[PDB]
């Protein structure tokens, strides 16, 4: 069937521009999003120590 993605007209009123004005000017974007999704560093590194450890196979 259908789906129309990335197809949405803007708000264009008094208050909702302040959500798009604080975004560009003071960067509430790009740090709450992209500075937190990188860190996300505390997870365990899934590395195989190849001369000692070995991975799975199949019969």
């Amino acid at each position: 069937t259908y789906k129309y993605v990335n197809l949405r007209e803007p708000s264009m009123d008094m208050k909702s521009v302040t959500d798009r004005a604080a975004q560009t000017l003071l960067w509430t974007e790009l740090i709450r999003g992209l500075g937190m999704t990188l860190s996300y560093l505390f997870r365990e590194p899934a590395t195989i120590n190849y001369p000692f450890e070995k991975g799975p196979l199949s019969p």
């Binding site: 803007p10 264009m12 008094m14 521009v17 798009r20 004005a21 560009t24 000017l25």
Partner: protein, 80 residues
């Protein structure tokens, strides 16, 4: 012209904020009385040596004693 501030602040929100800092910066030094306190201090900073003068008859004011109430009062700042 009332939406002209609302069809450019939702269109190019960079230089709009510049003109607001172009404003509110020229006007206010002519407004608050905290200025001319800037002038009274910046003149009352002694760089050079205050050389005394010669008496002849008068004496309108200011005898030789420095700790006498003979000159002005800039000592409001220490009380400020």
């Amino acid at each position: 012209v009332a939406a002209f501030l609302k069809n450019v602040w939702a269109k190019e929100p960079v230089l709009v904020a510049s003109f607001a800092i172009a404003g509110l910066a020229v006007i206010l030094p002519t407004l608050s009385p905290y200025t001319k306190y800037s002038l009274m201090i910046n003149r009352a900073t002694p760089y050079n040596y205050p050389v005394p003068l010669r008496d002849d008859g008068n004496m309108p004011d200011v005898p030789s004693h420095p700790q006498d109430p003979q000159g002005p009062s800039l000592e409001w700042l220490k009380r400020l």
